[PDB]
Symmetry: C4
Subunit: 80 residues, 4 copies
Amino acid sequence: TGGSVHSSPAIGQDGTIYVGSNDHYLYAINPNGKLKWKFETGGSVHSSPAIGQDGTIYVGSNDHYLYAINPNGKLKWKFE
Amino acid sequence: TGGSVHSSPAIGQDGTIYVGSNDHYLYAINPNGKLKWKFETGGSVHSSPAIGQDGTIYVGSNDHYLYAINPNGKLKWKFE
Amino acid sequence: TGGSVHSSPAIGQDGTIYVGSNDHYLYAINPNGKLKWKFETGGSVHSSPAIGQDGTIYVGSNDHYLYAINPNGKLKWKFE
Amino acid sequence: TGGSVHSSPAIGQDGTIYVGSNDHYLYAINPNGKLKWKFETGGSVHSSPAIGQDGTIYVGSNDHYLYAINPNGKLKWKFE
């Protein structure tokens, strides 16, 4: 990615790999290694994502928000 | 949250999202993005929570305690 | 514990909570909050433990070893 | 390992233990404590590995890449 990947990846039920980066994005990567989408947060993503039963991706950011991202990469909500 | 969210979220069986914050609280967030409860520890929560088979939430804190929190947000015990 | 708990806890099949500490020990805590055992490593335990299918607890330490601990708290092996 | 093990281990379905090290390698360790293989990345592995449904091991590295490693230790792809 654009920067160091400190976040630990989480795997969705279809095999999608989600991981944060110090370049401030949450990445969703297809199992073939091609980008599915990237979601820009405010700061570095030092949280490792967690996946909900309905596929929602949750990750903390250094901008003080907990993000909930839909599986298509659009923001579901952010909590401060 | 009040501060950076470094802790990685854990998801309960009902979808509740638990995550620590540098503002010293453990948060329980409903899947709709509304706060369920917050639990104040002594220091920053740099541990990622783990959920037991009975729903108990365990998380370490920088105050040197391992916390066990009931699913309703009340302290079950703390271990030093 | 003796020091900050940065490690994220892992839960065994019987509910035992395993977590590392900056006081250099891996703790095994019963769900009632009483100590089961503690295992001394060389340095701080900044790795979060993982539990194998046979109950073995694996954790990295800052002494450069990956530890494998039996569920009764005795060393199974260490890898450098 | 050659250096501190900060990464948290992941366990494969056959019991293989995967863990990163500050010596820049991802290790695959058999449950008997013998090395299966090691994979050299560019920098320290501060990400904890995740294992896919087909056994692929994913881990971030400080060289800015997300690595996908086959269970036999050969690179599947790297994403930047």
